[PDB]
Design a protein around this ligand. Structure first.
Ligand SMILES: [Ca+2]
Length: 123
């Protein structure tokens, strides 16, 4: 049970931690580890929200997000960027792709809770 979150995160410990935080807030989680599978996973299912890590192994968050936004169900799904480098490049790249919001790493469980409730708490 719970709204379905697509988590796009390549680092193993962040996968562990963020998937656990999401499940601790009642969410279902689908984990992908790069931009390309994020694009596929978003075109094959309607998520309630997508958490897009900015820096990924092969296809980064900017390009992945532009691809999802060009899908007819992807035009409108909330996409929240995860950034460790807002002022070291991500505001000049990832964050311009058509995000609803962003979360700065390292982030608290409460901060994750508050950004998701903002975007999908009313629906
Ligand atoms: Ca990363």
């Amino acid at each position: 049970a719970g709204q379905e979150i697509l988590l796009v995160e390549d680092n193993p410990v962040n996968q562990t931690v963020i998937e656990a935080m999401l499940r601790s807030l009642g969410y279902r989680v689908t984990l992908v580890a790069d931009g390309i599978q994020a694009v596929r996973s978003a075109e094959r299912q309607r998520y309630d929200a997508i958490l897009m890590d900015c820096r990924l192994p092969v296809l980064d968050g900017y390009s992945a997000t532009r691809e999802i936004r060009a899908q007819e169900n992807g035009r409108r799904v909330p996409i929240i960027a995860l950034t460790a480098n807002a002022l070291q490049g991500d505001r000049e790249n990832c964050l311009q792709a058509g995000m609803n919001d962003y979360l700065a790493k390292p982030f608290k469980r409460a901060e994750l809770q508050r950004i998701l409730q903002r975007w999908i708490g009313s629906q």
